Amino acid sequence: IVGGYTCGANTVPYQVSLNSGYHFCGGSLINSQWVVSAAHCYKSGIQVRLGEDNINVVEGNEQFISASKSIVHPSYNSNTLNNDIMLIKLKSAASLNSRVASISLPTSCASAGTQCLISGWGNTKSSGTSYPDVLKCLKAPILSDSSCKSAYPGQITSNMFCAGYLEGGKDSCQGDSGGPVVCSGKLQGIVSWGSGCAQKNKPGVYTKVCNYVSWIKQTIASN
């Protein structure tokens, strides 16, 4: 996250870190046994790390649970990033409390102008690199559809939204991939892609989760 603030330990209780020997993607806990992330985060051998603030220090609220199954969306296209969403089932159910909690799925899509919280452990610089060890937060609005398609001509599908600032300086960034965009207590977006980070007129692009709610529900009811 570029131009954000330190969230505070366990203040984003649904945030997960996907680990394959190192943090490589964020994700969101949607119930005690399922995590949703970005399909471009797919990897074999994922351990899900819950209750994290400092991902390099065991601080006492962590739950490390290995993945038993991963399901990439059936129409994921890695060239266009259309339908960049994946579900991960945990080998055992997470123990839920004030610091480890699931986030609600939306019943309605969020409108442009809605303020949202984006969070993750990714790069905090738009120019060069510096990775935080503690969780970073960013409040950003959902941008209008037409400003989103104007910033990314011929690249925005109906399964994407832009969120952020056309002026730049505040954005999600590499390593924030798969992480949550929560608006009014509901998961609305997944950190998906963008042109660099925090660049002028190149806002972050997010997977529009409200389009996938029935595939998610159907899939966890059957797996």
Interstrand relation of 160-163 and 34-37 (parallel, antiparallel or unpaired): unpaired
- Residue 222 CB, nearest approach to ligand TPA (Å): 30
Which of 15, 17, 177, 188 binds ligand TPA (CB under 6 A)? It is 177
Reply yes or no on whether 73 is catalytic: no
Reply yes or no on whether 177 is catalytic: yes
Q: Would you count residue 176 as binding ligand TPA (CB under 6 A)? A: yes
- Residue 120 CB, nearest approach to ligand TPA (Å): 8
Measuring CA to CA, which residue among 52, 27, 50, 1 is closest to residue 179? 27
Exposed / middle / buried, residue 172 (Cβ in 10 Å: 0-12, 13-18, 19+)? buried
Q: Give the integer Cα–Cα distance in Å for 25 and 122.
A: 8
Interstrand relation of 136-141 and 115-120 (parallel, antiparallel or unpaired): antiparallel
Closer of 142 and 191 to ligand TPA (Cβ): 191
Q: Would you count residue 191 as binding ligand TPA (CB under 6 A)? A: yes
Q: State whether residue 151 is helix, strand or coil.
A: helix
Q: In this structure, are residues 118 and 172 in contact, taking their beta carbons and an 8 Å threshold?
A: yes
Interstrand relation of 47-50 and 186-193 (parallel, antiparallel or unpaired): unpaired
Measuring CA to CA, which residue among 83, 118, 112, 101 is closest to residue 209? 83
All residues at 6 or more sequence positions from 26 whose CB lies less than 8 Å from its CB, including other chains = 15, 16, 17, 18, 37, 119, 120, 121, 122, 175, 176, 177, 178, 179, 180, 191
Closer of 177 and 207 to ligand TPA (Cβ): 177
- Residue 200 CB, nearest approach to ligand TPA (Å): 11
Which tokens belong to 210?
A: 């409200």
Closer of 157 and 219 to ligand TPA (Cβ): 157
Which residues is the chain interrupted after (C–N above 2.5 Å)? none
Q: Give the active site residue among 37, 84, 102, 119.
A: 84
From Ca ion, ligand TPA, none, interface partner of 167 (C-beta below 5 to 8 A by class):
none
- Of the listed pieces 9-17, 26-34, 77-85, 197-205, which binds ligand TPA according to CB under 6 A? 197-205
Closer of 51 and 122 to ligand TPA (Cβ): 122
Reply yes or no on whether 176 is catalytic: no
Which of 194, 209, 212, 216 binds ligand TPA (CB under 6 A)? It is 194
Active site (catalytic) residues: 40, 84, 177
* Binding-site residue positions: 52, 54, 57, 62, 171-172, 174-175, 177
Contact footprint for ligand TPA (CB under 6 A): 171-174, 176-177, 191, 193-194, 197, 202, 204
Contact footprint for Ca ion (CB under 5 A): 52, 54, 59
